[PDB]
């Protein structure tokens, strides 16, 4: 078998800037994905960004994860088991945060 | 999630014409592999057999059917895999058969 998760869709992103005064901000995400190939689209109130590359892994015990890169530096979200939400971080070369993901 | 059968690699054929006359014939078949996209090549000691369209599809009860159109040197065969991807039996239409195929 050659089995890939479905992240494929939109999902509600609830920001968490802990860099420099950040605020919680929120975004909407677009997983645009055909098999391995995933793009990332992310609209919130500062325009938006692109990804650039990406990649998805399997950790057991873990579950699945997404890392890319973006151009508006890096993200990577780790999803539970049942693909419903994920928690990740993102870090901008300097800004940084933990950004929740939630299907819809 | 997101999963096809892994049926790539040479596959052994033993083959016999259903038709009027005919004997058990033997050939190898490559299976290529990308996602769903598969191509079928069949070579014997008589004449190859090449494939053109190819889909793979999986019926409850059955499991995974492979069928294609192919070309000698347009007719259809058509396989269901069974026991892991291991073995698999099927039948082609120009001349017909079966075909009892086995995983190197």
């Not at 920001?15 to 950040?22: I, P």
């Not at 890169?69 to 419903?84: C, H, I, P, Q, V």
């Amino acid at each position: 078998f050659l089995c890939v998760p479905n992240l494929e869709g939109r999902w509600h992103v609830d920001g968490h800037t802990r860099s420099e005064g950040g605020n919680t901000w929120e975004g909407e995400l677009k997983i645009v994905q055909t098999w391995d190939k995933v793009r990332i689209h992310l609209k919130t109130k500062a325009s938006h960004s692109d990804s650039v590359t990406a990649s998805i892994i399997y950790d057991k015990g873990i579950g699945y994860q997404l890392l890319y890169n973006y151009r508006n530096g890096f993200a990577e979200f780790r999803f539970d088991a049942d693909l419903k939400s994920a928690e990740g971080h993102y870090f901008n070369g300097a800004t940084y945060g933990t950004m929740t993901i939630t299907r819809i």
